Enzyme design. Structure first.
Site, PDB file in Angstrom:
ATOM      1  CB  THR A 159      -9.495  25.067  20.588  1.00 60.51           C
ATOM      2  OG1 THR A 159      -7.597  24.288  19.909  1.00 60.51           O
ATOM      3  CG2 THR A 159      -9.418  25.903  21.638  1.00 60.51           C
ATOM      4  CG  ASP A 173      -1.557  22.930  14.819  1.00 51.44           C
ATOM      5  OD1 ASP A 173      -1.806  22.432  15.945  1.00 51.44           O
ATOM      6  OD2 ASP A 173      -0.759  22.635  14.219  1.00 51.44           O
ATOM      7  CG  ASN A 217     -11.295  19.703  12.986  1.00 49.97           C
ATOM      8  OD1 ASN A 217     -11.214  19.132  13.729  1.00 49.97           O
ATOM      9  ND2 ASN A 217      -9.418  19.808  12.222  1.00 49.97           N
ATOM     10  CE1 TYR A 242      -5.045  15.348  12.291  1.00 47.31           C
ATOM     11  CE2 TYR A 242      -4.969  15.566   9.990  1.00 47.31           C
ATOM     12  CZ  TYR A 242      -4.775  15.789  11.216  1.00 47.31           C
ATOM     13  OH  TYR A 242      -5.264  17.659  11.336  1.00 47.31           O
ATOM     14  CB  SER A 249     -13.864  27.353  10.421  1.00 48.07           C
ATOM     15  OG  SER A 249     -13.181  25.807  10.295  1.00 48.07           O
ATOM     16  CG  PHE A 302     -12.857  15.191  11.245  1.00 50.13           C
ATOM     17  CD1 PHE A 302     -14.166  14.568  10.934  1.00 50.13           C
ATOM     18  CD2 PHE A 302     -11.877  14.381  12.152  1.00 50.13           C
ATOM     19  CE1 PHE A 302     -13.402  12.946  10.942  1.00 50.13           C
ATOM     20  CE2 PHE A 302     -11.610  12.979  11.135  1.00 50.13           C
ATOM     21  CZ  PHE A 302     -12.582  12.020  11.198  1.00 50.13           C
ATOM     22  CB  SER A 351       3.834  17.517  15.688  1.00 46.87           C
ATOM     23  OG  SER A 351       3.321  19.069  15.342  1.00 46.87           O
TER      24      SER A 351
END
Ligand SMILES: Nc1ncnc2c1ncn2[C@@H]1O[C@H](COP(=O)(O)OP(=O)(O)O)[C@@H](O)[C@H]1O
Ligand SMILES: Nc1ncnc2c1ncn2[C@@H]1O[C@H](COP(=O)(O)OP(=O)(O)O)[C@@H](O)[C@H]1O
Ligand SMILES: Cc1ncc(CO)c(CO)c1O
Ligand SMILES: Cc1ncc(CO)c(CO)c1O
Ligand SMILES: [Ca+2]
Ligand SMILES: [Ca+2]
Ligand SMILES: [Ca+2]
Ligand SMILES: [Ca+2]
Ligand SMILES: [Ca+2]
Ligand SMILES: [Ca+2]
Ligand SMILES: [Ca+2]
Ligand SMILES: [Ca+2]
Ligand SMILES: [Cl-]
Lengths: 289, 295
Positions: free
Chosen positions: B147, B224, B149, B127, B186, B151, B10
């Site tokens: 990579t 990012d 997260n 999202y 994490s 979620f 983005s």
């Protein structure tokens, strides 16, 4: 902080023009660069193939709607405009600057400084429709600083910039149009072929007086891309804490380090991070009588 | 040199996410960042209003034709993908990476490394459309490094990542899918620390864990900056050390953000990462997180 720039320039995936030339230098200097990308292209206009997206006026006003709605416009102590090459967006910048000035005034901040790089052509060649030239004449009624190359200064003023006398005439045209501070970044001189001359012209709105400064750099062989874009970005950075004459000297020194590094077309902006902040030498910028 | 990255993320005018977060750190590490901006938005999606332009597939293939015609594709030793949020562009990244690998082979260059950050959601919220989740599952079969997260790891693998054991189960899913190297950046006893997993799949898997201080507050762009730093360090470090250094970069950047007003209780604007504040700390973090082998 006041080190916040709205930078309305090109984006290219490959190479160093527009926001790709301006962003790294300004960030190195501690500025937040908020970029509106007037185009998003594969590469600059000099490669055999150019592909990608150009903003229309509706995309520009849509982005402004987002900036306005989240109340960011008072962030912008500086507005730097470069490659737009679109009559409607060049005209709309005036409204964007007026809305930034209003938001900063309402919050009691220092006036924004609008730096207008009237990007239209180089090396005799015009990039834009003639309607863009007149759009820049109207927008320059609102600029604090203008940084034309000699071609842009010539086509805007209708004065052939070929020496210090004609540079001064072109600069005086910018002052009359309403730009108080002008840097004509370089012009060749028949009578001094190994140098480029620059002019800094500073009109005092109150007194009507003009302080003029000039100097030279070595005239390096070859054609370079992005020199103006790195120059204007560097000028914004130095002019934040330096008087404009010294700011022009440092910005010239940054470009001389970059060009001389390229020699020992594409400016490798990210290879010389210390040279971008502390040029190996400053150009003398001397007052004229 | 091979310090050229094609970064497909983005662009935002205000704030620090995607290519704006990734570019400055990679440039400070001496990389040329060739950015394809999948969206050009006023700000990140956390703000009450988000305005601007989104690429469709045709805009993506148009830029790709420029890069192809100018023979730029063989320069890309690294491909880094982040925010795309477009099922057709996510699908098209496999063909892009394949074409870069062929142009590199043709020119006697070493193979590219494709880093896929499957940017889909955070703090329990998607999202993106459900379509984008499956397109990531299929792209990840072609990724060298992923990579997610916790979620993203959870919805891709369908394992609830809530501890070290479940993180390992989710990472195993990525390996079975075809991704040799996974960093689960994490997860969650000890409320004052976050734990991370590095998993590297000969059929055998080497796993590593480590911890960072948990700072209260919601930051965006952390992933990012992390993936960008991981690319920079992994160019001249083994992956365990590169994770350790990328973790150190994030701890410095989050501390500087809190230092300059970015508390848990502060505004979205105040919580924007201070990416420009400490450039030396982006190259040389004040701490390097330990990344310790699991048995
Ligand atoms: N051939 C050259 N030799 C020396 N300096 C140059 C040369 N070309 C550009 N520059 C430097 O970079 C700046 C170049 O911008 P200029 O050519 O004036 O603007 P633009 O790139 O907008 O046409 C100058 O002020 C000067 O410092
Ligand atoms: N609140 C936090 N406290 C401490 N470190 C954090 C915090 N948020 C993010 N980080 C750091 O940033 C990295 C990336 O953040 P993470 O939330 O995992 O990814 P994403 O931003 O993609 O959701 C983590 O590995 C960690 O080092
Ligand atoms: C896209 C784009 N942006 C900026 C410039 C000026 O350096 C050029 C010069 O050709 C350009 O093509
Ligand atoms: C536009 C955009 N880009 C990147 C990210 C991830 O930090 C987000 C998180 O919401 C986002 O909205
Ligand atoms: Ca007041
Ligand atoms: Ca020129
Ligand atoms: Ca030129
Ligand atoms: Ca120019
Ligand atoms: Ca997160
Ligand atoms: Ca695979
Ligand atoms: Ca977050
Ligand atoms: Ca993320
Ligand atoms: Cl002269």
């Amino acid at each position: 902080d006041d080190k916040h720039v709205l930078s309305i320039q090109s984006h290219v995936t490959h190479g160093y023009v527009g926001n790709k030339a301006a962003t790294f230098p300004l960030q190195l200097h501690g500025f937040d660069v908020d970029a509106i990308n007037t185009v998003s292209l594969s590469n600059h206009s000099g490669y055999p193939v150019i592909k990608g997206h150009r903003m229309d006026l509706e995309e520009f006003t849509t982005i402004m709607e987002g900036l306005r709605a989240n109340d960011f416009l008072s962030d912008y102590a500086y507005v730097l405009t470069g490659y737009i090459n679109n009559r409607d967006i060049v005209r709309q910048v005036a409204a964007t600057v007026a809305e930034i000035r209003e938001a900063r005034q309402k919050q009691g901040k220092k006036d924004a400084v609008f730096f207008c790089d009237p990007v239209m052509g180089d090396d005799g060649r015009l990039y834009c429709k003639e309607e863009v030239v007149e759009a820049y004449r109207e927008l320059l009624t609102h600029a604090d600083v203008a940084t034309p190359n000699y071609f842009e200064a010539s086509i805007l003023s209708t004065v052939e910039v070929k020496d210090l006398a004609s540079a001064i005439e072109a600069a005086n045209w910018f002052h009359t149009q309403g730009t108080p501070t002008v840097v004509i970044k370089s012009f060749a001189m028949a009578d001094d072929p190994t140098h480029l001359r620059f002019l800094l012209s500073c009109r005092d709105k109150a007194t009507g007086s003009t302080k003029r400064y000039t100097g030279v750099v070595p005239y390096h062989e070859g054609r370079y891309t992005g020199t103006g874009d790195v120059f204007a970005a560097s000028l914004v950075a130095f002019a934040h804490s330096d008087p404009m004459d010294l700011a022009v000297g440092k910005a010239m020194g940054v470009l001389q380090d970059l060009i001389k590094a390229t020699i020992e077309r594409e400016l490798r902006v990210t290879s010389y991070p210390d040279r971008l902040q502390h040029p190996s030498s400053v150009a003398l910028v001397t007052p004229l009588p």
